[PDB]
Design a protein around this ligand. Structure first.
Ligand code: GUS
Ligand code: CA
Ligand code: CU
Length: 223
């Protein structure tokens, strides 16, 4: 997260860290046994870490649970990043509490202009590299469909939406990948892609979760 703020320990209870010997992606807890992340974050040997703030220090509220199954969307296209969503099932149910909680899935898509909360442990530099140990947060508005398509000609599908600031300075970045974009208390987006970080006229692009609720529900209903 570039140009954001320190969230505050466990203030984003649904935020998870995907670990494969190190933090490599974010994710969102949608219920005690399932996590929603980006399909491009896929890899084997994933351990889901919940209740995390500083990912390099055991602070006492964490829950480490290995993934038992990963399900990348059937139509995920890594070339275009269309359908960049993946479900991860935990080997065991997480113990839900005040610091580890699920985030509700949307019933309707978010409206352009809505201010959402983006979070993660990704790069905090626009030009250069610096990874925080504690969770970072960013308040960012959903940009217009028109502005999004103009920023990335011929690359924005109906399963994507842009959020951020065209003037640059505030954006998600490498490492926040797979993380949440919450608007009005609903998981409306997944940190997916963009062009660099916090660059002018190049806002972050996010997977439009509201288009996948049927697939998510059917999938967790049979797995
Ligand atoms: C590191 C690289 N992902 C970069 C990445 C960048 C953004 N942000 C942005 N350009 N505004 C969001 C999600 C991402 O996964 C990768 O998958 O190898
Ligand atoms: Ca920790
Ligand atoms: Cu990425």
């Amino acid at each position: 997260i570039v140009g954001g703020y320190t969230c505050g320990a466990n203030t984003v209870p649904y935020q998870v860290s995907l670990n494969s010997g190190y933090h490599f992606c974010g994710g969102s807890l949608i219920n005690s046994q399932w996590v929603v992340s980006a399909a491009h974050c896929y890899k084997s040997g994933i351990q889901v870490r919940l209740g995390e703030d500083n990912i390099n220090v055991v602070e006492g509220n964490e829950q480490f649970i290995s993934a038992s199954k990963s399900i990348v969307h059937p139509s995920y296209n890594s070339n275009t990043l269309n359908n960049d969503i993946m479900l991860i099932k935990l080997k065991s149910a997480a113990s839900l509490n005040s610091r580890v909680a699920s985030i509700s899935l949307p019933t309707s898509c978010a409206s352009a202009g809505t201010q959402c909360l983006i979070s993660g442990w990704g790069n905090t530099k626009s030009s250069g590299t610096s990874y925080p140990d504690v969770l970072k947060c960013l308040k960012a508005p959903i940009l217009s469909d028109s502005s999004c398509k103009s920023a990335y000609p011929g690359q924005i599908t109906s399963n994507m939406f842009c959020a951020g600031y065209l003037e640059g300075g505030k954006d998600s970045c490498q490492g926040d990948s797979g993380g949440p974009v919450v608007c009005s208390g609903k998981l409306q987006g997944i940190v997916s892609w963009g062009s660099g970080c916090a660059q002018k006229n190049k806002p972050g692009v996010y997977t439009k979760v509201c288009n996948y609720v049927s697939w998510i529900k059917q999938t967790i209903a049979s797995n």
